Amino acid sequence: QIVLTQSPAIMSASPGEKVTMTCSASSSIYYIHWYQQKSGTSPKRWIYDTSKLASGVPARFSGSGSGTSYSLTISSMEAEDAATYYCQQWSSNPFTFGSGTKLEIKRTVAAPSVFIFPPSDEQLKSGTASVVCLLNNFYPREAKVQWKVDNALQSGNSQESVTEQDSKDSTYSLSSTLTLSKADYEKHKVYACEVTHQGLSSPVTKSFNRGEC
Amino acid sequence: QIVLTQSPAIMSASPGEKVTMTCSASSSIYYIHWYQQKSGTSPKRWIYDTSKLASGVPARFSGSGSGTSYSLTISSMEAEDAATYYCQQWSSNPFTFGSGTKLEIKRTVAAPSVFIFPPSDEQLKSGTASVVCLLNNFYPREAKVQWKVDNALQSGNSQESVTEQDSKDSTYSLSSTLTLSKADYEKHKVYACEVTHQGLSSPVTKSFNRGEC
Amino acid sequence: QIVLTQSPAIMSASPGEKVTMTCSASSSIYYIHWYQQKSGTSPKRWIYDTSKLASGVPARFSGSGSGTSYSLTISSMEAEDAATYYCQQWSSNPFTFGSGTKLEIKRTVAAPSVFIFPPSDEQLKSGTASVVCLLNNFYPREAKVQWKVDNALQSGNSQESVTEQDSKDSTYSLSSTLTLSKADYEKHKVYACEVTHQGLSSPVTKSFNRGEC
Amino acid sequence: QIVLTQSPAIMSASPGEKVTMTCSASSSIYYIHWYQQKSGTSPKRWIYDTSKLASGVPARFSGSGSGTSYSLTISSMEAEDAATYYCQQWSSNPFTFGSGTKLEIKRTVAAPSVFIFPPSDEQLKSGTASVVCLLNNFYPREAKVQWKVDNALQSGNSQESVTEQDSKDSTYSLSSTLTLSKADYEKHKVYACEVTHQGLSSPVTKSFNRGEC
Amino acid sequence: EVQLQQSGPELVKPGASVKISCKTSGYTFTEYTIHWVKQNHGKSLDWIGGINPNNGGTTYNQEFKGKATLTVDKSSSTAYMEFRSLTSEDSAVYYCARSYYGYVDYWGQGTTLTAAASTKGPSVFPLAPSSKSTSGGTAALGCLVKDYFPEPVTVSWNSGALTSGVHTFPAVLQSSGLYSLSSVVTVPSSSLGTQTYICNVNHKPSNTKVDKKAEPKSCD
Amino acid sequence: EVQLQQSGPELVKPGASVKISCKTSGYTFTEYTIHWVKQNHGKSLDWIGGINPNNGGTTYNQEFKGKATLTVDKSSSTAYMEFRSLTSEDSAVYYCARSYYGYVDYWGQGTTLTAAASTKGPSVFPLAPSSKSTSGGTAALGCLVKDYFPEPVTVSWNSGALTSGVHTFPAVLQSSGLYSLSSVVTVPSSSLGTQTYICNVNHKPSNTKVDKKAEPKSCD
Amino acid sequence: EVQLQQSGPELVKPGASVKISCKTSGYTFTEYTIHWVKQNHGKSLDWIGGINPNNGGTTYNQEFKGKATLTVDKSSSTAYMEFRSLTSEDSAVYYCARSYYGYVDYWGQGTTLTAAASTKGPSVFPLAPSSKSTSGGTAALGCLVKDYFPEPVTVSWNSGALTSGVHTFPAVLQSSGLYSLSSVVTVPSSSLGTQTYICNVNHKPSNTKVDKKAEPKSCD
Amino acid sequence: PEPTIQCGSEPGPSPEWMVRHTLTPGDLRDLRVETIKSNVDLEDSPILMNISWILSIRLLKATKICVMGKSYSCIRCNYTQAFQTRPSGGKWTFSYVGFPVELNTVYFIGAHNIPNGPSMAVNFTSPGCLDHVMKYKKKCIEAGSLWKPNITACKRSANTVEVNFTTSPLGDRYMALIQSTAVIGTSYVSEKELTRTSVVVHVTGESEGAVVQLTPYFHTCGNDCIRQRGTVVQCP
Amino acid sequence: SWILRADASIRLLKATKICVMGKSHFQSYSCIRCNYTQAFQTQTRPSGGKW
């Protein structure tokens, strides 16, 4: 019945800084094991029997603990370490995993480049208008996007999607999609995307006027 | 006969938070037992003999107490914990259950999308007019729906129905049906559904004029 | 008017085991408070307002309950925990205590070392003879001591005294004192103390012959 | 309450050898602190806030860990490092110390020089005879000292006392004192001290004949 | 392995008898008490009674003594509960369950009993998509299943072929005593002219099956 | 820090009156109720009563009413308890304690009250180690402290230097009305004849002090 | 530089009170919490409690709450710990120490408390040099310092004028409760007949000073 | 560490006070029973009950226990001492070992204190010879309850099966049978030695994956011996 | 060989029983009981490592 609580659930570290993450068992276990998983592949055994490194695993990683409290430590963060780490026990049935620590790379602030896309003519033939606002290569992940149509704030008609950290520059990108009927789209002229981010001193606004190529 | 008073009757908790519910016996019992029931299926033995976990129950659950005072605790709420929990005794005849604690998932506020439907011509040809107002994918459950017919506020001629929490996003949806005689429907023109909800800064209205497309 | 019933009156717990003791009120109370008392000193506030720990109290302790039923719990017994615990209420006059749970620490079985002491000549000169049998550093507390004088079993002329559990090794010691007149004492030769204890497979007898050093 | 388990309880290291000792907390703490204590003086702050060196501490010392698991490391053992090391926490009340690691300095084997001292005549006047056997400047501490009186093996009538490690050569010295009543001492002739030690190919005996001159 | 297999749902006229069964397997029938439990739409669990299969000895919740009767058949390892004079109040899910000591460790799957003196099939009306039911490129449409008795009805869309946001609201008791239900689906507004939406309504008590095509309104 | 300092032990003629005191410090005396608590030889705790030092208002346990009177003296920050006619049933330890809400957060150290018609110091006899003892092995020796009243006696060994291996047993009330106890220590048998063992017995109620050397019995 | 200076060793009769002091200097008294720590012969460190001198806030190890009381005196920059009823279990070294965060950075030198009724000075016996205590031309001789209480004794030789190998055997607790130690010195064997060796034994608890001439055995 | 019990027989107040026709509440657990093998060896052992009870009336002098097999026998256990309730950290518990247990029998056990269905009662139905405790019953052992022949059956040709098995000391005759949709082969075997023997059975049809049934004819079981099953497989 | 868990229950431990079952054509089954000569004072070995 043993459950494993992992903390923190998500964290970021700059290359070179020390990283610790914990695994807490609802009751005592004989060993804890840790797996590394990067997006799109199988987990890999990383630290096993609480403190042993699987072959090839960098020695900047170490494990320790006993009873109900265990931890995984990276003496110095490297970019290749960004990953999700799961702990795991099989001292009692059922075999259980922890909920995972997702470790991301901290980098300097970078403001997004903002782009806005009107609905294509192909889509408008179908009756629906998707307006797309793109925030490209920014850091940190936190960002606010507000839609304005003829300077009227929108709400409830947009969805956001965010990529994972870019493998090369560690930035995020974000899309916000405002969806309207063709009827409502052809009623208004100015479509604006207003972007708030720590890397911008004032919100940046990008806009187009409907039908002005 | 032992009555088992359960508190709170209904509660919501965000995933990962600590949950306590209590079971108070009208007189002392030797043991309390707990069952979990999700809508539309059989109860499952959950905690038995006051503090023992049934086979399969994660150790984030614990039970304790003695005499007349018992509790069930979840150390960290998970989405799958959403359910009704009944405590139970058979230290005395009759065997009795408690009134149940319904445990729901707390999530961020989400404003409803409002849709309105005129009566079909098929229903009119039969003598009655049902006007339907739909609130889709909102949270929390509390919502006020007011019907207006030619701007006259209605009361006593509508009924509401609400879904269970959605399995994916934990939202509710609600239908409100206003029923009029065919005579009354054909006597008035503007039918409006006015929706008040925490996720809307001001009440939203959806309306139609009888005989519009 | 309210009285408090505590159970169990006396208990011993293995090191590491979970301990619960209960307090039952004759009618409902707003709070229960718990005091610890070790032999020879004043009670100390231990848990108050039902579930709050006084400063310095180990977090292995917890209290809970409501209405008429309360309990004090030790998650894992430590030797330092052995003491008498009293619950207490002042929801009604008079202020009352429960009769206490005396909690002792279990250890491995240990047989007593038995010693027998003849009466001194100084005491005999006064007309009375005390024969003392000593059972030293044994566990558990239960032990049978039978006096035999020239193989005649004695009864009604002996008293026992038992120490409290030793703080360091958790054993008991016991004295049995057989008291006789000088007249009866000088009529017999063989004075024997026979000891039955769980840690001895066969009873042990210690003897002396009167007036032999 | 929070227990700090230190391992190993006792160890020795040769000069130049790497030394690690661990401190394991029964529950999680924010920092661990370490104190050094040499015989007969106050403990001294050594490592604090888990990894910082107290004033005066050579950097061959380092501390590491987090959660429940901590360690102190000496990169190259020096003779001046022999001491008892205590870890300590004050993340929860009560403030607690660990049970301590006693670190001694290892050296090459050295056989004892064995010396015997008969009782003084001054002491025999008072009624007792202390026979003293000396083991001088040996390593390791382990040694067997058996007394024989007129070739009769003794047991239960002697006590040993062992010095601290010598400041210059790191050896031990040991005294064994055989104590007898004046009666029993003047009753026998040959008093022998038999020494068994790893540095001796065969056990050494030093003797005197009572009543020589 | 332990299994408690209950009989199927029953529609029964008030005043008639019905006997529901609990077929047990995977253990020694006579060693464990069998309990029966009622659950109304009020969701509360009500103990009805228990039976020792060894001798048929019973104890009842007194609100059910003389309304329900519990029996066993040792040869089939089967427990039974009989309502000899069903009333409208007895419509509910009924569970059997096995206990050792004071707790229930295995439950039957439940038996729905519906007490109805008559049946009435529903009328099925479209909830037609329009601009007033459109938002964010999503159109809502549905079927209103009105004036049926007793419960339940089932509603599917496009015979199970439809992948969409589905909301089937619980039935509501009308003041006439008849029920009404709405089933709604959310779909791309751009699909309303090429894709057809049919709700499949089944009302077993009246042996009524209705398929209703739902299309947007258009002016004459 | 809060401290409740209680007066010392009292020997009281049966039927006579006695007054014990409780000196408070470290807090505003008039702000907290003072309670008094009895603990008999059965070790159960009995509340006697409490007093509001601000106004002198009192509430008594009616199982004690008329036997005890509580007073305060605000100027000295002291609470008092007076028994008008102490009897043998009243011999016990008495605590003062300060309350916050329904619990007591500070206790005095206790005052023993003993109703005694007379005092009698003990006789102290040697418990002589046995000659028939094992080679090496462990020998026991002790002191029998007999026929004193009232409690307590104190026993040390070698003026307090000998504590290891010492068991001083709880006093036993004899059928004569007097108490008796033994204090024993276990030592290596080879220490018999090399070491001196003296038990120092003190009985403050009777101003009796006895030192007794315990030696192996003399063969001849 | 910061200093914590503690009062001297004390013998205290069991049942009496004692208050030991910790005089601080070199820093602002009100800026640091003062802790007290016990170390008996078992050598483990036991925290007793701490006090903030600025506002009097305290926290205890509950094994000492009710047994020790902590106080401060701002004018002298001094902290105190008081035992109200010292018992033999309380004989130990007691340290004060200063903290700011969770660690203590400065320690007092320690105060030895002995809970006993009396002290006893040593008897000093010779360990006479002879051929049986000689090897490689060096003779060992010494003083046996036996049956004293409590610790410690100090031994010098020839009033500090002697250069020699020194072996100081730590005190051993005897089964009487009294201590015994040997102080041994190694000197040239050819020096015996010409040089005199006096061990100067000092026992501060009993205010005893003894000089003992240790003379060669005449039997080589 | 508690008061002791000395138990002996005594007549019983007729089997009506125990088997009432109502339910006793299931959380009245002061009386416990478990079936136990008394003999520690692996030969034939008697199978007895371990009846335990927990002792809120203060003191008492005897507890009566009656066991009904569907037989009726009662024991009266006198306490040699009493203490004026629970001195150890557990409750106050006693156990009595006795009442030999028969196969496939339902057992009613009720108990009541002296001086004082009943609150102390437990029921259980005993298993048969395939049960891990009851298989050590003498009658089960003599039917082959402990026989571990470890059947291996191997298809040699189109009409032969090789059957290997370990014999039992209880008997010398065995019948090996091969069956798919019908019996395709039979062999009656005599084997005096305790070994893992081998036997060829002549088969008439396809014998791959068929059931092999080994019937022992031990003199004590007649035609009711416990039969052993395996399956014909291919060969290495 | 066996390792003892390092928890407080070790303070009550007095023996470990070992049973060995051989699955040969005729199975063997024998048990040994190993009694500890003293009580365990520390939950782990003082020189390092579990008992």
Ligand SMILES: *[C@@H]1O[C@H](CO)[C@@H](O[C@@H]2O[C@H](CO)[C@@H](O[C@@H]3O[C@H](CO[C@H]4O[C@H](CO[C@H]5O[C@H](CO)[C@@H](O)[C@H](O)[C@@H]5O)[C@@H](O)[C@H](O)[C@@H]4O)[C@@H](O)[C@H](O[C@H]4O[C@H](CO)[C@@H](O)[C@H](O)[C@@H]4O)[C@@H]3O)[C@H](O)[C@H]2NC(C)=O)[C@H](O)[C@H]1NC(C)=O
């Ligand atoms: C069946 O399998 C098991 C598991 O594989 C085998 O178990 C092995 O047994 C051997 C034999 O005993 C062990 O080696 C020995 O361990 C001793 C214990 O060392 C520990 O404690 C030391 C400190 O305590 C020591 O000294 C004190 C007093 O000085 C004593 O109280 C105590 O008894 C100890 O002796 C630490 O220093 C040390 O690090 C350990 O933590 C060793 O003391 C012992 O050394 C002695 O003998 C040596 C020659 O063998 C000699 O060089 C030394 O000088 C010294 O005299 C020796 O190393 C293994 O540790 C143990 N392994 C495991 C995993 O348990 C078992 O042997 C095997 N059976 C057979 C028949 O094959």
Ligand SMILES: *[C@@H]1O[C@H](CO)[C@@H](O[C@@H]2O[C@H](CO)[C@@H](O[C@@H]3O[C@H](CO[C@H]4O[C@H](CO)[C@@H](O)[C@H](O)[C@@H]4O)[C@@H](O)[C@H](O[C@H]4O[C@H](CO)[C@@H](O)[C@H](O)[C@@H]4O)[C@@H]3O)[C@H](O)[C@H]2NC(C)=O)[C@H](O)[C@H]1NC(C)=O
């Ligand atoms: C009171 O004290 C708090 C700290 O206790 C101060 O808060 C810090 O403020 C400084 C700047 O004043 C911050 O330094 C900035 O860090 C950014 C990175 O942010 C991440 O990393 C830090 C850890 O280093 C985290 O604390 C933080 O939450 C994020 O996780 C840098 O990117 C910053 O540079 C950015 O800003 C400047 C303009 O301001 C741009 O020109 C840069 O290009 C870039 O965009 C800067 O280095 C620090 O992060 C803050 N720490 C915390 C914990 O909040 C308060 O400033 C102080 N109050 C006052 C009045 O001084």
Ligand SMILES: *[C@@H]1O[C@H](CO)[C@@H](O)[C@H](O)[C@H]1NC(C)=O
């Ligand atoms: C300030 O806080 C520190 C750290 O807790 C404490 O030591 C000090 O006494 C405090 N100072 C005052 C003046 O209270």
Ligand SMILES: *[C@@H]1O[C@H](CO)[C@@H](O)[C@H](O)[C@H]1NC(C)=O
């Ligand atoms: C139990 O006590 C009764 C009555 O005292 C007696 O008749 C009976 O023989 C006793 N039973 C045993 C087994 O001693």
Ligand SMILES: *[C@@H]1O[C@H](CO)[C@@H](O)[C@H](O)[C@H]1NC(C)=O
């Ligand atoms: C034992 O069987 C009787 C008779 O059927 C019954 O009254 C009782 O409930 C059974 N015992 C238990 C514990 O159920």
Ligand SMILES: *[C@@H]1O[C@H](CO)[C@@H](O)[C@H](O)[C@H]1NC(C)=O
């Ligand atoms: C009988 O049962 C009790 C309860 O489980 C148990 O403690 C006891 O050891 C058992 N006795 C035997 C001989 O099996």
Ligand SMILES: *[C@@H]1O[C@H](CO)[C@@H](O)[C@H](O)[C@H]1NC(C)=O
């Ligand atoms: C069965 O017999 C085969 C062949 O002798 C052997 O390899 C196997 O281990 C045996 N299995 C058992 C469970 O005895």
Ligand SMILES: *[C@@H]1O[C@H](CO)[C@@H](O)[C@H](O)[C@H]1NC(C)=O
């Ligand atoms: C049966 O035993 C024979 C003879 O030892 C051996 O050759 C054969 O492989 C065995 N076959 C099986 C199926 O066990």
